[PDB]
Scaffold this motif. Structure first.
Motif, short mmCIF file in Angstrom:
data_model
loop_
_atom_site.label_atom_id
_atom_site.label_comp_id
_atom_site.label_asym_id
_atom_site.label_seq_id
_atom_site.Cartn_x
_atom_site.Cartn_y
_atom_site.Cartn_z
N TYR A 7 0.86 -1.19 0.00
CA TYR A 7 0.00 0.00 0.00
C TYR A 7 0.90 1.24 0.00
O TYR A 7 1.81 1.34 -0.84
CB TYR A 7 -0.98 -0.09 1.16
CG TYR A 7 -1.93 -1.26 1.08
CD1 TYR A 7 -2.53 -1.61 -0.13
CD2 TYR A 7 -2.23 -2.02 2.20
CE1 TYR A 7 -3.40 -2.68 -0.20
CE2 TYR A 7 -3.10 -3.08 2.14
CZ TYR A 7 -3.68 -3.41 0.93
OH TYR A 7 -4.56 -4.48 0.86
N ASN A 8 0.71 2.20 0.91
CA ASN A 8 1.51 3.41 0.89
C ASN A 8 2.75 3.34 1.79
O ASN A 8 3.27 4.38 2.19
CB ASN A 8 0.63 4.63 1.24
CG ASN A 8 0.08 4.60 2.68
OD1 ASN A 8 -0.11 3.54 3.29
ND2 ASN A 8 -0.18 5.78 3.22
N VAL A 9 3.27 2.14 2.05
CA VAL A 9 4.33 1.94 3.02
C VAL A 9 5.49 1.20 2.37
O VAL A 9 5.29 0.17 1.72
CB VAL A 9 3.83 1.14 4.24
CG1 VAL A 9 5.01 0.76 5.13
CG2 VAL A 9 2.79 1.96 4.99
N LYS A 24 9.45 4.67 4.45
CA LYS A 24 8.66 5.69 3.77
C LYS A 24 7.17 5.44 3.95
O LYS A 24 6.71 4.29 3.94
CB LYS A 24 8.97 5.75 2.27
CG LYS A 24 10.39 6.15 1.96
CD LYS A 24 10.49 6.47 0.46
CE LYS A 24 11.80 7.10 0.12
NZ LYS A 24 11.71 7.92 -1.15
N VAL A 25 6.42 6.53 4.05
CA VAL A 25 4.97 6.53 3.95
C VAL A 25 4.56 7.65 3.00
O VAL A 25 5.10 8.76 3.06
CB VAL A 25 4.30 6.71 5.33
CG1 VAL A 25 2.81 6.72 5.21
CG2 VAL A 25 4.77 5.64 6.30
N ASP A 26 3.62 7.35 2.10
CA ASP A 26 3.10 8.36 1.16
C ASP A 26 4.23 9.03 0.39
O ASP A 26 4.19 10.23 0.12
CB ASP A 26 2.25 9.41 1.88
CG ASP A 26 0.84 8.94 2.20
OD1 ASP A 26 0.31 8.04 1.50
OD2 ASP A 26 0.26 9.50 3.15
N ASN A 27 5.26 8.26 0.06
CA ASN A 27 6.37 8.65 -0.80
C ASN A 27 7.36 9.60 -0.13
O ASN A 27 8.05 10.35 -0.83
CB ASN A 27 5.89 9.28 -2.12
CG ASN A 27 4.65 8.61 -2.66
OD1 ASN A 27 3.51 9.09 -2.45
ND2 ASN A 27 4.84 7.48 -3.32
N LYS A 126 -6.54 0.33 2.96
CA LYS A 126 -5.31 0.31 2.16
C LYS A 126 -4.41 1.51 2.40
O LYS A 126 -3.60 1.87 1.54
CB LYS A 126 -5.60 0.20 0.65
CG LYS A 126 -6.78 -0.65 0.31
CD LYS A 126 -6.79 -0.96 -1.20
CE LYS A 126 -8.15 -1.45 -1.62
NZ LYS A 126 -8.27 -2.91 -1.40
N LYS A 127 -4.51 2.15 3.56
CA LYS A 127 -3.59 3.19 3.98
C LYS A 127 -3.17 2.92 5.42
O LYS A 127 -3.98 2.43 6.23
CB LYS A 127 -4.22 4.60 3.85
N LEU A 128 -1.91 3.19 5.72
CA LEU A 128 -1.40 3.04 7.09
C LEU A 128 -2.21 3.88 8.07
O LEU A 128 -2.50 5.05 7.81
CB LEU A 128 0.06 3.46 7.13
CG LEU A 128 0.78 3.37 8.47
CD1 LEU A 128 1.25 1.96 8.69
CD2 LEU A 128 1.96 4.31 8.47
N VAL A 129 -2.59 3.28 9.22
CA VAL A 129 -3.23 4.08 10.26
C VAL A 129 -2.45 3.97 11.56
O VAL A 129 -2.58 4.84 12.43
CB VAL A 129 -4.70 3.69 10.52
CG1 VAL A 129 -5.60 4.18 9.41
CG2 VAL A 129 -4.85 2.20 10.82
#
Ligand code: CL
Ligand code: CL
Ligand code: CL
Lengths: 247, 246
Positions: A7-9, A24-27, A126-129
């Motif tokens: 996902y974004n990780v 990295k998260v969200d690039n 599908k996003k880190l929380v």
């Protein structure tokens, strides 16, 4: 070491320490640091978000106790978990206690639980929380419990307390037949003066304890947590809410 | 002459539209409904404090599913279920006492107007609490009544000692502001803005040491934030669900 991605990780697995490191998260480059109950007091954690058990450059949003989350396993698959339980966790960084009740999920299958590594990303849509911080093998529930640290969920309580003492905070079990005042738990009657005379005497002598060393205590049993802030023996404040305490 | 219902002996004061409870369980009691600020009498010191009351009799923990019966001015009783959560507080002698409390609602305002301050609240025919405050929740269009007593399961209670003689006055947290210590500010200057304010206050912590301690209660419909500060340095915060009974 090349980084894995979900996902974004972007992350890697450290088999020596049995941890997952998120790079990295969200690039962009992040710092997500799982803390025990006591940080190393590094200045570089000061500028990060603190939630119990973590200091993170990335916001951990509020979750509810009913929606499904997905926790990343060591083999690259994920476990679908519902964080419907409530556990309290805390850490200390630089003489500040950060505590919160947190939504918590349980894994009855200890084969799966052993595949959940410290620092593993927890995803929602599908996003880190959040990330895995602590775990607790619950005897009575016969399951491994995992708090999902982040912003205080609806219906739960969070707080922070600045104190002075260098020995940190060490929770103590509240023994049967004792009540708390300030730093102490005592039975009602003397033996030790007894909680009623102690509380009255400490309040009466408030001015002699003014500005003395501030200590935080956490008294717990299965049902209740009591957190007090004291200066000397004088109780400046108390908070009471439901256990269990993750400890 | 005293009236009697279950284990309670009481009178109705018409001049003041309140119920005075004289005896519980065959002994003389002192049950004093407090505003948000007591008169600070020493006689309240040895009583049990729960938000809005100082009482010589224990008010036990209630749950939010079991029925209660509140005594009306005409001697009849209303069956209520305290299924809602509101927070109330009072200050006595520089000590804030606050708690989320199980709260019942009356949609019929003619029945609500028969519920008097101090009215006994019964569970299984025994006194469990008394009517303290009420709030016209014009959103849900009902009168809300907290049932003060020991913290219900799943709710939070606490107490904070402070110094200031001006007491505690809750303040509505305005849109776009965040709290640090005594203040609520927007993120950016215009003042200094909360991000810059919080950092400067934490850095300058030792300069606020031992100054006057103030408690603030910041609220909106969804959240309550209670802070303890010395000078501008925030010693503690606690955050939990609103609404606030105020
Ligand atoms: Cl994210
Ligand atoms: Cl908090
Ligand atoms: Cl309390």
């Amino acid at each position: 070491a090349k980084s894995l991605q979900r996902y974004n990780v972007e992350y890697t697995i450290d088999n020596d320490l049995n941890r997952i490191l998120i790079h990295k998260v969200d690039n962009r480059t992040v710092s997500i640091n799982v803390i025990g109950h006591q940080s190393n007091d590094s200045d570089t954690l000061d500028r990060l978000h603190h939630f119990p058990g973590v200091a993170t450059s990335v916001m951990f949003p509020r979750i509810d106790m009913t929606s499904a989350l997905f926790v990343l396993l060591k083999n690259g698959a994920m476990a679908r978990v519902v964080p419907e339980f409530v556990y309290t966790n805390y850490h200390v960084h630089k003489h500040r206690l950060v505590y919160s009740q947190l939504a918590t999920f349980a894994l009855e299958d200890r084969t799966v639980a052993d595949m959940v590594l410290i620092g593993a990303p927890i995803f929602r849509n599908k996003k880190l929380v959040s990330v895995v911080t602590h775990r607790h093998d619950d005897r009575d529930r016969d399951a491994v419990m995992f708090p999902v640290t982040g912003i205080r969920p609806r219906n739960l309580v969070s707080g922070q307390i600045q104190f002075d003492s260098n020995n940190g905070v060490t929770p103590e079990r509240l023994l049967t037949g004792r009540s708390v005042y300030g730093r102490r738990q005592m039975s009602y009657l003397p033996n030790s003066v007894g909680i009623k005379e102690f509380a009255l005497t400490s309040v009466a002598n408030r001015a002699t304890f003014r500005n003395l060393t501030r200590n935080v205590h956490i008294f717990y049993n299965d049902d209740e947590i009591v957190i007090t802030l004291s200066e000397g023996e004088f109780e400046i404040s108390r908070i009471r809410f439901d256990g269990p305490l993750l400890y």
